[PDB]
PDB file of C-alpha atoms and ligand atoms in Angstrom:
ATOM      1  CA  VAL A   1      94.113  70.055  82.823  1.00  0.00           C
ATOM      2  CA  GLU A   2      91.957  70.523  85.924  1.00  0.00           C
ATOM      3  CA  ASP A   3      94.792  69.860  88.386  1.00  0.00           C
ATOM      4  CA  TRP A   4      96.611  72.958  89.643  1.00  0.00           C
ATOM      5  CA  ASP A   5      99.648  73.530  91.841  1.00  0.00           C
ATOM      6  CA  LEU A   6     100.023  76.587  94.076  1.00  0.00           C
ATOM      7  CA  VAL A   7     103.641  77.510  93.408  1.00  0.00           C
ATOM      8  CA  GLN A   8     104.199  80.981  94.876  1.00  0.00           C
ATOM      9  CA  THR A   9     102.675  83.791  96.931  1.00  0.00           C
ATOM     10  CA  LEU A  10     102.051  86.791  94.677  1.00  0.00           C
ATOM     11  CA  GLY A  11     100.463  89.365  96.970  1.00  0.00           C
ATOM     12  CA  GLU A  12      98.126  90.083  99.867  1.00  0.00           C
ATOM     13  CA  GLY A  13      94.805  91.903 100.040  1.00  0.00           C
ATOM     14  CA  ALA A  14      94.506  91.490 103.814  1.00  0.00           C
ATOM     15  CA  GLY A  15      94.191  88.318 102.165  1.00  0.00           C
ATOM     16  CA  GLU A  16      96.567  86.501  99.790  1.00  0.00           C
ATOM     17  CA  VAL A  17      97.139  86.018  96.060  1.00  0.00           C
ATOM     18  CA  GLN A  18      98.900  82.853  94.925  1.00  0.00           C
ATOM     19  CA  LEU A  19     100.184  81.700  91.552  1.00  0.00           C
ATOM     20  CA  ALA A  20      98.634  78.465  90.298  1.00  0.00           C
ATOM     21  CA  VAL A  21     100.189  76.389  87.530  1.00  0.00           C
ATOM     22  CA  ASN A  22      98.365  73.661  85.631  1.00  0.00           C
ATOM     23  CA  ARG A  23     100.332  70.404  85.996  1.00  0.00           C
ATOM     24  CA  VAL A  24      99.421  69.403  82.417  1.00  0.00           C
ATOM     25  CA  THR A  25      99.291  72.609  80.350  1.00  0.00           C
ATOM     26  CA  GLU A  26     101.614  74.713  82.506  1.00  0.00           C
ATOM     27  CA  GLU A  27      99.067  77.486  82.096  1.00  0.00           C
ATOM     28  CA  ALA A  28      99.127  79.975  84.954  1.00  0.00           C
ATOM     29  CA  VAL A  29      96.354  81.688  86.853  1.00  0.00           C
ATOM     30  CA  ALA A  30      96.301  83.961  89.865  1.00  0.00           C
ATOM     31  CA  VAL A  31      94.271  82.728  92.843  1.00  0.00           C
ATOM     32  CA  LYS A  32      92.839  85.300  95.232  1.00  0.00           C
ATOM     33  CA  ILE A  33      92.133  83.705  98.612  1.00  0.00           C
ATOM     34  CA  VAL A  34      89.692  85.419 100.957  1.00  0.00           C
ATOM     35  CA  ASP A  35      88.982  84.497 104.562  1.00  0.00           C
ATOM     36  CA  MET A  36      85.194  84.752 104.890  1.00  0.00           C
ATOM     37  CA  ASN A  37      81.241  91.880  99.873  1.00  0.00           C
ATOM     38  CA  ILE A  38      83.056  89.071  98.086  1.00  0.00           C
ATOM     39  CA  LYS A  39      79.780  87.931  96.528  1.00  0.00           C
ATOM     40  CA  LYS A  40      79.448  91.340  94.895  1.00  0.00           C
ATOM     41  CA  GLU A  41      83.046  91.309  93.677  1.00  0.00           C
ATOM     42  CA  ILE A  42      82.301  87.982  91.979  1.00  0.00           C
ATOM     43  CA  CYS A  43      79.109  89.246  90.387  1.00  0.00           C
ATOM     44  CA  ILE A  44      80.861  92.300  88.957  1.00  0.00           C
ATOM     45  CA  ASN A  45      83.865  90.234  87.828  1.00  0.00           C
ATOM     46  CA  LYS A  46      81.548  88.005  85.763  1.00  0.00           C
ATOM     47  CA  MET A  47      80.537  91.078  83.711  1.00  0.00           C
ATOM     48  CA  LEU A  48      84.094  91.985  82.736  1.00  0.00           C
ATOM     49  CA  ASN A  49      85.530  91.258  79.303  1.00  0.00           C
ATOM     50  CA  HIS A  50      88.225  93.700  78.130  1.00  0.00           C
ATOM     51  CA  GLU A  51      91.913  93.615  77.231  1.00  0.00           C
ATOM     52  CA  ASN A  52      92.729  96.162  79.954  1.00  0.00           C
ATOM     53  CA  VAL A  53      90.745  94.500  82.769  1.00  0.00           C
ATOM     54  CA  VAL A  54      91.951  91.390  84.675  1.00  0.00           C
ATOM     55  CA  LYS A  55      89.886  88.489  83.272  1.00  0.00           C
ATOM     56  CA  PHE A  56      87.799  86.432  85.719  1.00  0.00           C
ATOM     57  CA  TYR A  57      87.884  82.662  85.224  1.00  0.00           C
ATOM     58  CA  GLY A  58      85.794  81.362  88.151  1.00  0.00           C
ATOM     59  CA  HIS A  59      85.372  80.940  91.907  1.00  0.00           C
ATOM     60  CA  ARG A  60      85.443  78.191  94.528  1.00  0.00           C
ATOM     61  CA  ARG A  61      84.383  78.260  98.177  1.00  0.00           C
ATOM     62  CA  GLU A  62      85.963  75.443 100.191  1.00  0.00           C
ATOM     63  CA  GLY A  63      84.312  76.372 103.489  1.00  0.00           C
ATOM     64  CA  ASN A  64      84.872  79.793 105.050  1.00  0.00           C
ATOM     65  CA  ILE A  65      87.546  80.389 102.404  1.00  0.00           C
ATOM     66  CA  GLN A  66      86.600  81.756  98.988  1.00  0.00           C
ATOM     67  CA  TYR A  67      88.809  81.298  95.934  1.00  0.00           C
ATOM     68  CA  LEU A  68      88.865  83.604  92.920  1.00  0.00           C
ATOM     69  CA  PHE A  69      90.599  82.453  89.743  1.00  0.00           C
ATOM     70  CA  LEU A  70      91.956  85.380  87.754  1.00  0.00           C
ATOM     71  CA  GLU A  71      94.093  86.224  84.743  1.00  0.00           C
ATOM     72  CA  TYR A  72      97.752  86.095  85.876  1.00  0.00           C
ATOM     73  CA  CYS A  73      99.651  89.345  85.361  1.00  0.00           C
ATOM     74  CA  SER A  74     103.320  88.412  85.476  1.00  0.00           C
ATOM     75  CA  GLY A  75     104.505  92.030  85.294  1.00  0.00           C
ATOM     76  CA  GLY A  76     103.122  92.707  88.772  1.00  0.00           C
ATOM     77  CA  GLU A  77     101.895  96.087  90.070  1.00  0.00           C
ATOM     78  CA  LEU A  78     102.230  99.340  88.219  1.00  0.00           C
ATOM     79  CA  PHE A  79     103.209 100.705  91.660  1.00  0.00           C
ATOM     80  CA  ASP A  80     106.535  98.874  91.348  1.00  0.00           C
ATOM     81  CA  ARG A  81     107.368 100.543  88.020  1.00  0.00           C
ATOM     82  CA  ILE A  82     107.254 103.941  89.716  1.00  0.00           C
ATOM     83  CA  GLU A  83     110.663 105.109  90.982  1.00  0.00           C
ATOM     84  CA  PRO A  84     110.289 107.166  94.167  1.00  0.00           C
ATOM     85  CA  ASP A  85     110.853 110.883  93.485  1.00  0.00           C
ATOM     86  CA  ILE A  86     111.441 110.200  89.788  1.00  0.00           C
ATOM     87  CA  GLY A  87     108.420 108.467  88.271  1.00  0.00           C
ATOM     88  CA  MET A  88     109.132 106.758  84.925  1.00  0.00           C
ATOM     89  CA  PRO A  89     109.948 107.815  81.358  1.00  0.00           C
ATOM     90  CA  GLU A  90     107.182 109.994  79.931  1.00  0.00           C
ATOM     91  CA  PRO A  91     106.536 107.746  76.902  1.00  0.00           C
ATOM     92  CA  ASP A  92     105.990 104.784  79.291  1.00  0.00           C
ATOM     93  CA  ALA A  93     103.610 106.868  81.450  1.00  0.00           C
ATOM     94  CA  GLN A  94     101.659 107.932  78.378  1.00  0.00           C
ATOM     95  CA  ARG A  95     101.272 104.346  77.128  1.00  0.00           C
ATOM     96  CA  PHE A  96     100.098 103.142  80.531  1.00  0.00           C
ATOM     97  CA  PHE A  97      97.717 106.155  80.695  1.00  0.00           C
ATOM     98  CA  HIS A  98      96.237 105.349  77.260  1.00  0.00           C
ATOM     99  CA  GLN A  99      95.672 101.759  78.461  1.00  0.00           C
ATOM    100  CA  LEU A 100      94.150 102.898  81.752  1.00  0.00           C
ATOM    101  CA  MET A 101      91.690 105.160  79.848  1.00  0.00           C
ATOM    102  CA  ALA A 102      90.743 102.281  77.564  1.00  0.00           C
ATOM    103  CA  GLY A 103      89.945 100.094  80.605  1.00  0.00           C
ATOM    104  CA  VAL A 104      88.071 102.915  82.384  1.00  0.00           C
ATOM    105  CA  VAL A 105      86.021 103.810  79.286  1.00  0.00           C
ATOM    106  CA  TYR A 106      85.080 100.147  79.081  1.00  0.00           C
ATOM    107  CA  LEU A 107      83.932  99.900  82.682  1.00  0.00           C
ATOM    108  CA  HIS A 108      81.975 103.117  82.574  1.00  0.00           C
ATOM    109  CA  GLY A 109      80.441 101.900  79.278  1.00  0.00           C
ATOM    110  CA  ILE A 110      78.970  98.873  81.107  1.00  0.00           C
ATOM    111  CA  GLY A 111      77.806 100.997  84.057  1.00  0.00           C
ATOM    112  CA  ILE A 112      80.572  99.951  86.446  1.00  0.00           C
ATOM    113  CA  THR A 113      82.732 102.217  88.580  1.00  0.00           C
ATOM    114  CA  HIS A 114      85.935 100.826  90.097  1.00  0.00           C
ATOM    115  CA  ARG A 115      86.150 103.279  93.056  1.00  0.00           C
ATOM    116  CA  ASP A 116      89.741 102.414  93.993  1.00  0.00           C
ATOM    117  CA  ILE A 117      92.002 103.225  91.080  1.00  0.00           C
ATOM    118  CA  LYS A 118      95.660 103.377  92.130  1.00  0.00           C
ATOM    119  CA  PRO A 119      98.966 101.838  91.019  1.00  0.00           C
ATOM    120  CA  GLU A 120      98.605  98.908  93.430  1.00  0.00           C
ATOM    121  CA  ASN A 121      95.379  97.940  91.576  1.00  0.00           C
ATOM    122  CA  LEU A 122      96.744  98.287  88.039  1.00  0.00           C
ATOM    123  CA  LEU A 123      98.699  95.217  86.982  1.00  0.00           C
ATOM    124  CA  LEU A 124     100.969  94.444  84.045  1.00  0.00           C
ATOM    125  CA  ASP A 125     101.007  91.308  81.923  1.00  0.00           C
ATOM    126  CA  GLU A 126     104.053  89.694  80.287  1.00  0.00           C
ATOM    127  CA  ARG A 127     103.963  92.326  77.516  1.00  0.00           C
ATOM    128  CA  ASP A 128     103.606  95.247  79.934  1.00  0.00           C
ATOM    129  CA  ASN A 129      99.923  95.719  79.052  1.00  0.00           C
ATOM    130  CA  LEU A 130      97.981  97.389  81.846  1.00  0.00           C
ATOM    131  CA  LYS A 131      95.109  95.517  83.467  1.00  0.00           C
ATOM    132  CA  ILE A 132      92.657  97.070  85.977  1.00  0.00           C
ATOM    133  CA  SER A 133      92.418  94.801  89.039  1.00  0.00           C
ATOM    134  CA  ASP A 134      90.803  94.434  92.469  1.00  0.00           C
ATOM    135  CA  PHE A 135      87.049  95.040  92.060  1.00  0.00           C
ATOM    136  CA  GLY A 136      86.232  94.631  95.775  1.00  0.00           C
ATOM    137  CA  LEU A 137      84.990  98.273  95.955  1.00  0.00           C
ATOM    138  CA  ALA A 138      83.398  98.433  92.472  1.00  0.00           C
ATOM    139  CA  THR A 139      79.695  99.090  92.113  1.00  0.00           C
ATOM    140  CA  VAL A 140      76.984  99.723  89.509  1.00  0.00           C
ATOM    141  CA  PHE A 141      76.385 103.391  88.734  1.00  0.00           C
ATOM    142  CA  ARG A 142      74.164 102.948  85.654  1.00  0.00           C
ATOM    143  CA  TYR A 143      71.490 100.390  85.057  1.00  0.00           C
ATOM    144  CA  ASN A 144      68.779 100.293  82.401  1.00  0.00           C
ATOM    145  CA  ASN A 145      70.306 103.551  81.127  1.00  0.00           C
ATOM    146  CA  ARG A 146      69.525 105.312  84.386  1.00  0.00           C
ATOM    147  CA  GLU A 147      72.355 106.770  86.448  1.00  0.00           C
ATOM    148  CA  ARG A 148      72.555 106.220  90.189  1.00  0.00           C
ATOM    149  CA  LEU A 149      74.429 108.780  92.339  1.00  0.00           C
ATOM    150  CA  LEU A 150      76.924 107.372  94.835  1.00  0.00           C
ATOM    151  CA  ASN A 151      77.005 108.249  98.533  1.00  0.00           C
ATOM    152  CA  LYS A 152      79.364 105.699 100.075  1.00  0.00           C
ATOM    153  CA  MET A 153      82.760 107.099 101.026  1.00  0.00           C
ATOM    154  CA  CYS A 154      85.350 104.580  99.862  1.00  0.00           C
ATOM    155  CA  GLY A 155      88.662 104.322  98.085  1.00  0.00           C
ATOM    156  CA  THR A 156      92.169 105.402  99.180  1.00  0.00           C
ATOM    157  CA  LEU A 157      92.648 108.933 100.523  1.00  0.00           C
ATOM    158  CA  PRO A 158      95.493 110.254  98.335  1.00  0.00           C
ATOM    159  CA  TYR A 159      93.506 109.098  95.305  1.00  0.00           C
ATOM    160  CA  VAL A 160      89.951 110.149  96.249  1.00  0.00           C
ATOM    161  CA  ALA A 161      88.223 113.119  94.659  1.00  0.00           C
ATOM    162  CA  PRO A 162      87.361 116.125  96.851  1.00  0.00           C
ATOM    163  CA  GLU A 163      83.601 115.811  96.346  1.00  0.00           C
ATOM    164  CA  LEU A 164      83.647 112.439  98.070  1.00  0.00           C
ATOM    165  CA  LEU A 165      84.790 114.158 101.239  1.00  0.00           C
ATOM    166  CA  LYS A 166      82.449 117.133 100.953  1.00  0.00           C
ATOM    167  CA  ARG A 167      79.196 115.986  99.368  1.00  0.00           C
ATOM    168  CA  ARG A 168      76.388 113.664 100.470  1.00  0.00           C
ATOM    169  CA  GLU A 169      75.995 112.362  96.894  1.00  0.00           C
ATOM    170  CA  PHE A 170      78.152 112.545  93.820  1.00  0.00           C
ATOM    171  CA  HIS A 171      78.491 111.242  90.272  1.00  0.00           C
ATOM    172  CA  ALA A 172      80.638 108.080  89.829  1.00  0.00           C
ATOM    173  CA  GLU A 173      82.529 108.920  86.650  1.00  0.00           C
ATOM    174  CA  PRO A 174      84.346 112.096  87.702  1.00  0.00           C
ATOM    175  CA  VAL A 175      85.620 110.281  90.833  1.00  0.00           C
ATOM    176  CA  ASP A 176      87.344 107.607  88.687  1.00  0.00           C
ATOM    177  CA  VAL A 177      88.680 110.348  86.341  1.00  0.00           C
ATOM    178  CA  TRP A 178      90.256 112.100  89.331  1.00  0.00           C
ATOM    179  CA  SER A 179      92.007 108.974  90.611  1.00  0.00           C
ATOM    180  CA  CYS A 180      93.411 108.392  87.103  1.00  0.00           C
ATOM    181  CA  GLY A 181      94.873 111.958  87.301  1.00  0.00           C
ATOM    182  CA  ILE A 182      96.513 111.122  90.652  1.00  0.00           C
ATOM    183  CA  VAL A 183      97.932 107.926  89.058  1.00  0.00           C
ATOM    184  CA  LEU A 184      99.304 110.013  86.145  1.00  0.00           C
ATOM    185  CA  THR A 185     100.857 112.449  88.640  1.00  0.00           C
ATOM    186  CA  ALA A 186     102.564 109.539  90.462  1.00  0.00           C
ATOM    187  CA  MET A 187     103.868 108.062  87.204  1.00  0.00           C
ATOM    188  CA  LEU A 188     105.404 111.369  86.090  1.00  0.00           C
ATOM    189  CA  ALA A 189     106.797 112.558  89.454  1.00  0.00           C
ATOM    190  CA  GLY A 190     107.279 109.462  91.600  1.00  0.00           C
ATOM    191  CA  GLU A 191     105.279 111.071  94.404  1.00  0.00           C
ATOM    192  CA  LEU A 192     101.673 111.726  95.429  1.00  0.00           C
ATOM    193  CA  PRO A 193     100.615 115.390  95.501  1.00  0.00           C
ATOM    194  CA  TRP A 194      98.703 115.320  98.801  1.00  0.00           C
ATOM    195  CA  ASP A 195      97.532 113.218 101.711  1.00  0.00           C
ATOM    196  CA  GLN A 196      93.926 114.033 100.705  1.00  0.00           C
ATOM    197  CA  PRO A 197      92.142 116.766  98.756  1.00  0.00           C
ATOM    198  CA  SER A 198      90.713 118.485 101.835  1.00  0.00           C
ATOM    199  CA  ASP A 199      90.443 122.200 102.582  1.00  0.00           C
ATOM    200  CA  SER A 200      92.819 121.569 105.510  1.00  0.00           C
ATOM    201  CA  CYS A 201      95.584 119.952 103.395  1.00  0.00           C
ATOM    202  CA  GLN A 202      98.273 122.506 102.606  1.00  0.00           C
ATOM    203  CA  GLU A 203      99.474 120.673  99.519  1.00  0.00           C
ATOM    204  CA  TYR A 204      95.960 120.696  98.072  1.00  0.00           C
ATOM    205  CA  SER A 205      95.531 124.406  98.778  1.00  0.00           C
ATOM    206  CA  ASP A 206      98.857 125.036  97.045  1.00  0.00           C
ATOM    207  CA  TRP A 207      97.588 123.254  93.907  1.00  0.00           C
ATOM    208  CA  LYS A 208      94.312 125.185  94.025  1.00  0.00           C
ATOM    209  CA  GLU A 209      96.390 128.365  94.172  1.00  0.00           C
ATOM    210  CA  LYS A 210      98.368 127.253  91.086  1.00  0.00           C
ATOM    211  CA  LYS A 211     101.755 127.054  92.818  1.00  0.00           C
ATOM    212  CA  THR A 212     103.110 124.661  90.207  1.00  0.00           C
ATOM    213  CA  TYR A 213     106.688 125.719  90.960  1.00  0.00           C
ATOM    214  CA  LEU A 214     106.461 123.305  93.884  1.00  0.00           C
ATOM    215  CA  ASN A 215     106.855 119.525  93.703  1.00  0.00           C
ATOM    216  CA  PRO A 216     105.498 117.375  92.360  1.00  0.00           C
ATOM    217  CA  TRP A 217     104.319 119.752  89.620  1.00  0.00           C
ATOM    218  CA  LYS A 218     107.770 121.192  88.995  1.00  0.00           C
ATOM    219  CA  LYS A 219     108.949 117.754  87.782  1.00  0.00           C
ATOM    220  CA  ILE A 220     106.214 117.438  85.177  1.00  0.00           C
ATOM    221  CA  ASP A 221     106.502 118.778  81.625  1.00  0.00           C
ATOM    222  CA  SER A 222     104.136 121.579  80.657  1.00  0.00           C
ATOM    223  CA  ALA A 223     102.183 119.348  78.242  1.00  0.00           C
ATOM    224  CA  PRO A 224     101.064 116.569  80.661  1.00  0.00           C
ATOM    225  CA  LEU A 225     100.846 119.235  83.374  1.00  0.00           C
ATOM    226  CA  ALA A 226      98.220 121.007  81.255  1.00  0.00           C
ATOM    227  CA  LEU A 227      96.200 117.769  81.190  1.00  0.00           C
ATOM    228  CA  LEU A 228      96.513 117.437  84.977  1.00  0.00           C
ATOM    229  CA  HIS A 229      95.210 121.019  85.306  1.00  0.00           C
ATOM    230  CA  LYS A 230      91.994 119.795  83.523  1.00  0.00           C
ATOM    231  CA  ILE A 231      91.665 116.548  85.489  1.00  0.00           C
ATOM    232  CA  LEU A 232      92.389 117.712  89.057  1.00  0.00           C
ATOM    233  CA  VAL A 233      89.587 120.301  89.039  1.00  0.00           C
ATOM    234  CA  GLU A 234      87.739 120.598  92.362  1.00  0.00           C
ATOM    235  CA  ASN A 235      84.219 120.964  90.919  1.00  0.00           C
ATOM    236  CA  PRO A 236      83.366 117.550  89.434  1.00  0.00           C
ATOM    237  CA  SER A 237      80.849 119.148  87.065  1.00  0.00           C
ATOM    238  CA  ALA A 238      83.655 121.273  85.543  1.00  0.00           C
ATOM    239  CA  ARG A 239      86.194 118.442  85.537  1.00  0.00           C
ATOM    240  CA  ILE A 240      87.332 117.091  82.168  1.00  0.00           C
ATOM    241  CA  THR A 241      85.468 113.981  80.908  1.00  0.00           C
ATOM    242  CA  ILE A 242      87.136 111.015  79.208  1.00  0.00           C
ATOM    243  CA  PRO A 243      85.960 111.970  75.715  1.00  0.00           C
ATOM    244  CA  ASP A 244      87.772 115.296  76.189  1.00  0.00           C
ATOM    245  CA  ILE A 245      90.858 113.670  77.734  1.00  0.00           C
ATOM    246  CA  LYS A 246      91.127 111.699  74.472  1.00  0.00           C
ATOM    247  CA  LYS A 247      91.332 115.081  72.699  1.00  0.00           C
ATOM    248  CA  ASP A 248      94.073 116.489  74.919  1.00  0.00           C
ATOM    249  CA  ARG A 249      97.287 117.696  73.311  1.00  0.00           C
ATOM    250  CA  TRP A 250      99.607 115.603  75.505  1.00  0.00           C
ATOM    251  CA  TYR A 251      97.348 112.558  75.259  1.00  0.00           C
ATOM    252  CA  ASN A 252      97.856 112.729  71.477  1.00  0.00           C
ATOM    253  CA  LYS A 253     101.538 113.711  71.434  1.00  0.00           C
ATOM    254  CA  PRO A 254     103.777 111.171  69.689  1.00  0.00           C
ATOM    255  CA  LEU A 255     106.425 110.074  72.210  1.00  0.00           C
ATOM    256  CA  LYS A 256     109.408 107.723  72.008  1.00  0.00           C
ATOM    257  CA  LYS A 257     112.230 106.799  74.345  1.00  0.00           C
TER     258      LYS A 257
HETATM  259  N1  C72 B 301      95.619  88.873  88.922  1.00  0.00           N
HETATM  260  C1  C72 B 301      96.962  88.804  89.291  1.00  0.00           C
HETATM  261  O1  C72 B 301      97.809  88.196  88.604  1.00  0.00           O
HETATM  262  C2  C72 B 301      97.343  89.487  90.518  1.00  0.00           C
HETATM  263  C3  C72 B 301      96.419  89.969  91.387  1.00  0.00           C
HETATM  264  N2  C72 B 301      96.721  90.579  92.508  1.00  0.00           N
HETATM  265  C4  C72 B 301      98.006  90.840  92.857  1.00  0.00           C
HETATM  266  N3  C72 B 301      98.270  91.530  94.018  1.00  0.00           N
HETATM  267  C5  C72 B 301      97.255  92.442  94.564  1.00  0.00           C
HETATM  268  C6  C72 B 301      97.665  92.742  96.027  1.00  0.00           C
HETATM  269  C7  C72 B 301      96.727  93.788  96.667  1.00  0.00           C
HETATM  270  C8  C72 B 301      96.763  95.058  95.799  1.00  0.00           C
HETATM  271  N4  C72 B 301      96.315  94.753  94.431  1.00  0.00           N
HETATM  272  C9  C72 B 301      97.223  93.772  93.749  1.00  0.00           C
HETATM  273  C10 C72 B 301      99.072  90.317  92.034  1.00  0.00           C
HETATM  274  C11 C72 B 301     100.494  90.401  92.171  1.00  0.00           C
HETATM  275  C12 C72 B 301     101.172  89.806  91.111  1.00  0.00           C
HETATM  276  C13 C72 B 301     102.637  89.677  90.931  1.00  0.00           C
HETATM  277  C14 C72 B 301     103.484  89.985  91.995  1.00  0.00           C
HETATM  278  C15 C72 B 301     104.867  89.855  91.846  1.00  0.00           C
HETATM  279  C16 C72 B 301     105.376  89.443  90.625  1.00  0.00           C
HETATM  280 CL1  C72 B 301     107.096  89.282  90.429  1.00  0.00          CL
HETATM  281  C17 C72 B 301     104.544  89.132  89.554  1.00  0.00           C
HETATM  282  C18 C72 B 301     103.169  89.255  89.711  1.00  0.00           C
HETATM  283  S1  C72 B 301     100.089  89.146  89.994  1.00  0.00           S
HETATM  284  C19 C72 B 301      98.705  89.655  90.867  1.00  0.00           C
END
């Protein structure tokens, strides 16, 4: 029951994730190995308890190497369900998006911001249920009902909100909303819209100018495109919030393959 076998390498952060199988129960758990920041990731992980967030089981430091025991997601990365230049079937994208929102609402509800939402950090279990993963950049943005503004520039360029690049301080929530919009764009088009949302990035200027006849926008149906128009808004104070995303026409459209 307490004896585990490392059977296969799952991924690398960095910098390796291995699959551990219990010799008695045959239960599986993912083991994140870090050479050996991490202390914080463990503290935040201990707070997490939601169906759309990778569950944290425990940790073990055997010297300069730290071990994190996590809920195994046999479906792998959402990234790998995205066909380059195509995306995935709209009903599948919508279901994953609903699940992503549920996980994000949960984190924000407990005062946690992930800060690095992207398909490589969204995993799938055996039933294709989405699980938010990789809390190495996550931080507290609300404590004792008091919000703290962020100032650290972090994340992954194609997914980061424009205010992160332009402002000294910014609200946490709209940044996570923005990255979810970039994820939705990738799922529906199989391509990222820009290298970064900077004034010098032509693709970002094109979006700001509403040239939706260009890729990746041209590949996206008007309905989800209308939602993206509300999410990928430059001014974070004008950007759609999650409660309003839940009211969006596409978000509530019945879809079937
Ligand atoms: N908590 C888990 O389970 C878990 C955690 N992290 C993973 N990789 C990191 C790498 C760095 C970027 N973020 C994701 C992977 C990859 C998995 C897998 C891979 C292949 C197959 Cl076939 C099945 C599962 S499961 C898993």
